[PDB]
Amino acid sequence: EDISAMKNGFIVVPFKLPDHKALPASLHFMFAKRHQSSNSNESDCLFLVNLPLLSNIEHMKKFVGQLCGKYDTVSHVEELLYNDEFGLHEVDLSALTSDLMSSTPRNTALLKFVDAASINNCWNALKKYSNLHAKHPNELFEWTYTTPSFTTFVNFYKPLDIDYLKEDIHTHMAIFEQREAQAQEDVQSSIVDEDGFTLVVGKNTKSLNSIRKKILNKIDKKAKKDFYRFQVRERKKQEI
Amino acid sequence: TSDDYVLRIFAIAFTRKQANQVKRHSYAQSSHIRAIRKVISEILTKEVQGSTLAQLTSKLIPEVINKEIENATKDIFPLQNIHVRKVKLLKQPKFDVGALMALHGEEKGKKVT
């Protein structure tokens, strides 16, 4: 409880847990660093570990909001990237099978902010927050564990809205077929290299990608033992 | 079949002329006939072995087997009037009353007095 930051640098972020009749001051500890990355989407992010169950963005919106009011900081979380709590999205099966429609750790996620002004405000708020447990454990906020995404997730046996499903089929198929038609046109359009070389494309070929993957995936019988005089002379040596 | 029912099937098919065909006739070269015959034999073997006798009959009534022969042979040569001409039941397993009753979906008598 005296601990505030781990020597690897991770700021500890205690939380107070709800009151459930089954479980009659237990805390949940979240570990954070500043995340540095040249990739633009990964820039201005806050790295998080040991997240609570089903921690969607709205859970972080309240928590940063709780921080903002307490420490009068202006901070907004844009998005929570790489929040794969079950690991369902580890492999993008759509990307593997074809390039059309898809051009593409554990127990952790990246917390994106609006600007560097907001994130460093939050980091300072977290630093003060880390100190609270050592002194005054009562004023640690409370993680709710209930949110609209939680309720939908809890209701496993829910028939799907037919109309919403119906609309989804239509738009995707229209999207796919535009891509399918364009790709087929590209392959069979007399591609020529800058050096006046014409690519060979078979009939029924659909995606120039498939041509690449075909490539990547991929005299002795006509020789005569006795035709030249040196061959027979070799035979005669072995004969005697 | 999978139920150990040895049976013999006969399939009959005919060549057809395309929509824009101008030649009077539509004979197929012997290479195509052998190619078609190889495909037809494969499908008949695949369906029957991957099925029971009861399941096989359930395929015959809608004549789904014929449509698959067409879809497989569509590339080689256009065909018409594809049908399963005949089926012979050469050999049968030991009789199993339990299976027969299940296929058809015991009774106390009446006192005689």
Partner: protein, 1077 residues
């Protein structure tokens, strides 16, 4: 065959007796012969005089009942020096080591001068034999005292082969002459000289007890006792002729012992009558002929295997009891005769002795069946059958060896009822020497006749029979017997015939103007229960009608009535063990449920009929692509669902039976997986709306399927047939398979194992699932008791919280092993026999080193051939080479359908695999120490729940036992289909997702079926977890810990249990009640 030859050598040396022990005993009994020669002579005495002689002595004459009375004992008694000789297997040097202990047979031939020619009448010779033994024991005792040897010798009378008329003296050594370590016991058999009595007078048909009825048992006893040394010489010659004689004998001895066969008396009730001597003698006869044409069936040049196979074949194929018998000459070529004596008969013309007189008809049948089954195993080439033939004991449990077991407590059990005893009488006394023999037949004939065709084989066993009694007593003393009957109670063991075990009515003779003899006995036997009835075909026959019950079989009812009416009206018949097992099956909430038998699948067929109505509606529907075929795959289609389907019972897990829908091949299918998945969904929409319009009475809704990892777009149409069933449709496309293979190839190498895992589940649900149901539904019609046992087994797994990890297919394939590969046992014919068997196999299964491979075919094609067998074997050896401990894959189950073997058993954590073996072993050990009884069953089916690290109690808002169709109820689906969730159990979905979070840290288990194993209201279910050892202890922190932990130091964290409890708590919401850590 060379593998088999070596295996015999390895087995032969293992059981070989150690020669040092032979010398130690050979030291003893050679000296003992001196003591026997020390014993003096004795004079003619009357029964009064000998009684006075023994009146004060410690020894008592073991007279055989009826004991000699002064009036009928006019003939006098006398003793003379014997002719000491050694006989038996030890004589032939064919003995083997036995941990329990072997017996040395020493024969003393009382001199012929002590006989009159007519001493074989009215137990005259037997009574003389008795005192001759007693006089020896008297003097042997004092001479034993003189030599200072009595300190470590324990002398007691016993019956030879449990033959009441032939008492003998047994010498055993308790812990220089001390042979206790040898594990031997010297038996003193007092035989008669050869040809004292005319053998023709002693044939089985003739009688030697005046009262005329024949006396086969008494005639054999004296005649055999006079012909001992001759058969030794007979065996000795054949041993000299054929070199492989002794090796053949030991194999038969091992073969006999595993089946619980012995030379002991069988008319008393115990299984036996065919021992090493009978097996040996049969070989000797067959080496001198055996055919109907008197041609040799065995040749002296045969090896040990060939000799054993020939004898095994001959017993299996030739009938020796009802139709035909075999005659041979010990001192003449053996010839098989067609005429039969209705009893096991192996006649010996040279001696006029029937060697199988100790063999009962019922026992002989079980012998014939065992021989034939082993011949089948012997002729098998694909699988090695050495261990099954020789290295497996089938007699350890009666329940596993016999389909049904009934114990019958006879009345007034310190003597039987006067009425019961009065039934014995004199005429049966001359036929059957003892009441135990007579009662054994009485139970057998009524039990055999009443059950008739419903059974295959019957055994009547006298529980608590003793065969060795102290020298101070004249006969054995049973505690409940009181010198009246040597048994505590009788047990009736059956081998039921599944095809007709459950008939409602027992057929009988057809009606006639004049009552036929068969009609007479049928009417008399069944009494009021008899009835004359007409049928739809128009026949008139005598028949008796019973009532089916879901708690017990018809056979229990028949025998209970059968025994009371004929044996004794006070008899008590109780088989509670079978009753408890039947009740453990879920009782369906259908009309007249309690009266339906457990063999009735009417509930399943009703589901199939409703499906066919939907099956018709779909084809006549028009779509862009004509439907290729619709293949039902759901559990209820193959008679495996734990609870029988009930109309409108939608709370049950197995309400919605999956069905595969396949359209005709088209080349337009999307090449991209999600496009392909959503292309499939479009077709289901078209199927849905047309079905809605034309047939409004079908109610349908859409659900998502996430069984397949990373394929998040699968949508399945759920159809609610008006009759009250559910169906889940899914679309299979031929492009689907090749797309997955494309994903594997293009995936990164580190990811390839994961992608192939996804492919494994796809082929598990779509491609494999079809071939399994097809083979399993067909086979089940041959094995009637498959659907009950596999259902009850799946009930067992859920109670111990295993079904969550064991896929239902794997449970089926293990549960069918005892049927398709029943060796060395028989095919199960009872719920209790089959279930314990599945527990037995799992107990002795070494899944780390042994693969399980099954031939899913009907009883004797599609049987695995040697090439295919070896190929599957090769897969296992290659696999364990990569996984020697078995941590990745534990159970290797394969067949024609799954040659790979890893399709149905992948992804189970090792803790769950070991538990399923650990639970099995403890169960069998529990059955071993404590007999099969009500208390034992309850322990089997009640979970420990204490070993798990933390236990969380959950309660559903509403009891689901009614909505699961389980009779301790809904009649229409809710108007809003959203209401279905209000009557469902989410726990199976709760645990599965939480397992995925804590896969690195915890292993959570829950009861899938809450209605069956959740108490009276079916609302109590329990989630139980396990902390893996790594995260149980403190760890240095790292970004890759991937667990919910709390710090202790600057670089140390520990598993935050209390947080995880709250994670579960919010996740269960109102359901969670209590937490136990």
């Amino acid at each position: 065959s060379n593998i088999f030859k070596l295996q015999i050598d390895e087995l032969l040396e293992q059981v070989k007796l150690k020669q040092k022990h032979v010398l130690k005993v050979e030291k003893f009994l050679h000296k003992l012969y001196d003591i026997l020669q020390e014993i003096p002579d004795w004079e003619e005495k009357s029964l009064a005089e000998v009684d006075s002689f023994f009146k004060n002595k410690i020894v008592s004459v073991p007279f055989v009942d009826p004991k000699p009375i002064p009036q009928n004992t006019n003939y006098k008694f006398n003793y003379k020096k014997p002719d000491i000789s050694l006989i038996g297997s030890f004589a032939l040097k064919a003995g083997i080591y036995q941990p329990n202990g072997s017996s040395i047979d020493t024969l003393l031939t009382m001199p012929k001068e002590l006989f009159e020619k007519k001493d074989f009448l009215n137990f005259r010779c037997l009574h003389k034999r008795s005192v001759y033994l007693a006089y020896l024991t008297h003097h042997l005792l004092i001479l034993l005292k003189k030599d200072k040897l009595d300190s470590f010798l324990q002398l007691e009378y016993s019956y030879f082969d449990n033959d009441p008329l032939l008492p003998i003296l047994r010498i055993s050594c308790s812990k220089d002459y001390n042979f206790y370590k040898t594990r031997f016991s010297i038996n003193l058999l007092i035989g008669f000289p050869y040809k004292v009595f005319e053998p023709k007078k002693l044939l089985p048909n003739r009688n030697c007890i005046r009262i005329l009825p024949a006396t086969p048992l008494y005639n054999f006893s004296v005649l055999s006792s006079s012909t001992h040394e001759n058969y030794l010489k007979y065996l000795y010659k054949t041993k000299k002729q054929t070199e492989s004689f002794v090796e053949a004998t030991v194999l038969g001895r091992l073969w006999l012992q595993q089946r619980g066969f012995s030379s002991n008396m069988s008319h008393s009730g115990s299984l036996g009558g065919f021992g090493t001597f009978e097996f040996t003698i049969l070989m000797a006869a067959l080496l001198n002929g055996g055919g109907i044409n008197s041609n040799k069936i065995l040749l002296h040049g045969f090896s040990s295997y060939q000799l054993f196979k020939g004898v095994i074949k001959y017993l299996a194929t030739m009938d020796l009891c009802h139709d035909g018998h075999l005659q041979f000459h010990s001192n003449p070529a053996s010839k098989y005769i067609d005429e039969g004596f209705q009893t096991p008969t192996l006649f010996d013309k040279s001696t006029k002795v029937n060697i199988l007189t100790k063999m009962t008809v019922s026992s002989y049948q079980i012998l014939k069946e065992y021989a034939g089954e082993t011949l089948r195993m012997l002729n098998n080439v694909v699988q090695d059958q050495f261990s099954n033939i020789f290295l497996t004991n089938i007699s350890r449990f009666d329940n596993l060896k016999y389909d049904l077991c009934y114990d019958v407590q006879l009345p007034l059990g310190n003597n039987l009822e006067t009425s019961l005893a009065a039934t014995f009488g004199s005429m049966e006394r001359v036929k059957f020497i003892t009441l135990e023999n007579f009662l054994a037949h009485k139970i057998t004939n009524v039990a055999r006749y009443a059950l008739g065709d419903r059974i295959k084989y019957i055994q009547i066993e006298m529980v608590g029979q003793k065969s060795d009694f102290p020298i101070t007593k004249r006969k054995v003393y049973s505690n409940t017997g009181g010198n009246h009957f040597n048994f505590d109670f009788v047990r009736v063991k059956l081998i039921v015939n599944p095809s007709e075990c459950d008939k409602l009515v027992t057929k009988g003779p057809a009606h006639s103007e004049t009552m036929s003899t068969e009609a007479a006995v049928f009417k008399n036997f069944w009494g009021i229960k008899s009835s004359l009835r007409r049928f739809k075909d128009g026949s008139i026959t005598h028949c008796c009608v019973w009532s089916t019950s879901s708690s017990e079989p018809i056979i229990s009812s028949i025998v209970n009535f059968a025994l009371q009416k004929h044996v004794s009206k006070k008899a008590q018949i109780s088989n509670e063990t079978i009753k408890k097992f039947h009740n453990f099956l879920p009782l369906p909430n259908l009309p007249s449920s309690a009266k339906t038998s457990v063999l009735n699948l009417s509930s399943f067929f009703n589901l199939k009929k409703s499906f066919d109505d939907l099956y018709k509606i779909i084809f006549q529907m028009k779509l862009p692509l004509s439907v290729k075929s619709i293949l039902p795959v759901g559990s209820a289609f193959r008679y495996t669902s734990l609870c029988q389907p009930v109309p409108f019972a939608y709370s049950d897990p197995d309400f919605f039976q999956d069905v595969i829908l396949e359209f005709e091949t088209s080349p337009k299918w999307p090449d991209e997986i999600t496009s392909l998945e959503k292309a499939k969904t479009a077709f289901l929409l078209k199927i849905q709306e047309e079905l809605s319009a034309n047939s409004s009475t079908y109610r349908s809704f859409f659900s998502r399927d996430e069984s397949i990892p990373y394929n998040l777009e699968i949508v399945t149409l759920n159809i609610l047939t008006p009759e009250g069933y559910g169906f889940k449709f899914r679309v299979l496309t031929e492009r689907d398979e090749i797309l997955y293979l494309r994903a594997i190839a293009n995936a990164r190498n580190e990811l390839k194992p994961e992608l192939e895992a996804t492919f494994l589940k796809f082929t598990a649900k779509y491609l494999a699932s079809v071939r399994h149901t097809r083979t399993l539904e067909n086979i089940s019609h041959s094995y009637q008791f498959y659907s009950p046992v596999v259902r009850l087994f799946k009930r067992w797994l859920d109670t111990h919280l295993l079904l969550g990890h064991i896929t239902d297919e794997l449970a089926e394939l293990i549960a069918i092993k005892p049927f398709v590969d029943p060796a060395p046992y028989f095919i199960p014919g009872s719920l209790e026999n089959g279930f314990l068997k599945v527990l037995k196999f799992i107990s002795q299964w070494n899944w780390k080193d042994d693969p399980l491979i099954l031939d899913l075919v009907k009883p004797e094609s599609e049987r695995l051939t040697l090439a295919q067998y070896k190929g599957i074997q090769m897969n296992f050896t290659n696999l364990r080479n990569s996984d020697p401990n078995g941590t990745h894959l534990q159970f290797f189950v394969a067949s024609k359908n799954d040659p790979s073997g890893i399709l149905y058993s992948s992804g189970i954590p090792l803790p769950i695999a070991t538990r399923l073996t650990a639970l099995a072993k403890v169960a069998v050990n529990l059955l071993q120490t404590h007999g099969l009884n009500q208390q034992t069953i309850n322990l089997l089916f009640t979970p420990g729940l204490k070993d798990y690290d933390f236990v969380v109690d959950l309660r559903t808002p509403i009891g689901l036992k009614s909505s699961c169709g389980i009779l301790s109820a809904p009649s229409n689906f809710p108007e809003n289909l959203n209401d279905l969730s209000e009557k469902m159990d989410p726990t199976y979905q709760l645990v599965k997702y939480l397992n995925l979070k804590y896969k690195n840290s915890l292993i959570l288990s829950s009861r899938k079926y809450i209605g069956v194993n959740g108490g009276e209201k079916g609302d109590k279910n329990v989630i139980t977890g396990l902390i893996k050892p790594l995260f149980k202890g403190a760890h240095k922190f790292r970004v890759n810990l991937d667990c919910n932990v709390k710090p202790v130091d600057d670089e140390n964290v520990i598993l935050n249990k209390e947080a995880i409890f709250h994670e579960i708590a919010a996740f269960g919401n109102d359901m969670v009640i209590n937490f136990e850590t």
